[PDB]
């Protein structure tokens, strides 16, 4: 039946064509997703955005899609699954490349 969203999976980012921060959220109805980057809401754009690649029933599998990230994007990322019955918050650290030096 129904239930608050629950982040059942959030891992370090892996690099494919674009980089991906893999997540998995279970919850019904469909959870609203938001990310927090180092103590602030992350404003997505055409270089950083959320993509749900797999939606079974109440299980959603996706990525925080990143295009050409750099040390400039290292940091703690926080996915927020907000839904009609409540919310959940899980965090993950990300390293894409070290600072010049």
């Amino acid at each position: 039946s129904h239930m608050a969203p629950t982040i059942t999976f959030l891992e370090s980012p892996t690099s494919d064509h674009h980089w991906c921060i893999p997540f998995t959220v279970k919850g019904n109805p469909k959870p609203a997703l938001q990310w927090f980057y180092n103590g602030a809401i992350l404003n997505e754009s055409k270089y950083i955005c959320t993509k749900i690649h797999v939606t079974n029933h109440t299980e959603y599998h996706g990525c925080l899609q990143l295009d050409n990230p750099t040390h400039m994007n290292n940091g703690d990322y926080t996915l927020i699954a907000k839904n009609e019955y409540g919310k959940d918050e899980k965090q993950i650290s990300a390293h894409f490349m070290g600072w010049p030096g």
Binding site: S15, D16, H17, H18, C20, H53, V54, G98, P100
Partner: protein, 121 residues
């Protein structure tokens, strides 16, 4: 690990990008070896470094998509492939063999690409 399916577009060849602050020599667009100065003009100094991208380094042959081996998704029935570094030019403050200083177009690794060789029937 998340299934390759739950993620997006995959690369035929894995790459690694990062800053290169210690490239002291390069090859220009004329094939000559040149010295790469440590500092570039002003906009105080400013250390000169680059943004390079190479093929994911890999000793135990076998796995697809690794630099030096086959590429991911290629039809082995008709092709023999290999992931290679792809270079391009970027302008850099340099010194030639005569020591003359000046901006020059030098090659650096900017991508990892897949190459083919037919074997079809």
């Amino acid at each position: 690990t998340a299934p390759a399916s739950r993620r997006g577009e995959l690369a035929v060849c894995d790459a690694v990008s990062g800053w290169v602050t210690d490239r002291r020599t390069a090859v220009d667009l004329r094939g000559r070896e040149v010295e790469v100065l440590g500092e570039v003009p002003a906009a105080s100094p400013l250390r000169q470094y680059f943004f390079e991208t190479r093929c994911k380094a890999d000793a135990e042959e076998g796995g697809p998509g690794a630099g030096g081996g086959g590429c991911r998704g290629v039809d082995r029935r008709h092709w023999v492939s290999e992931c290679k570094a792809k270079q391009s030019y970027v302008r850099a403050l340099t010194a030639d063999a005569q020591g003359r200083v000046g901006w020059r177009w030098i090659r650096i690794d900017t991508a990892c690409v897949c190459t083919l060789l037919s074997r079809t029937g």
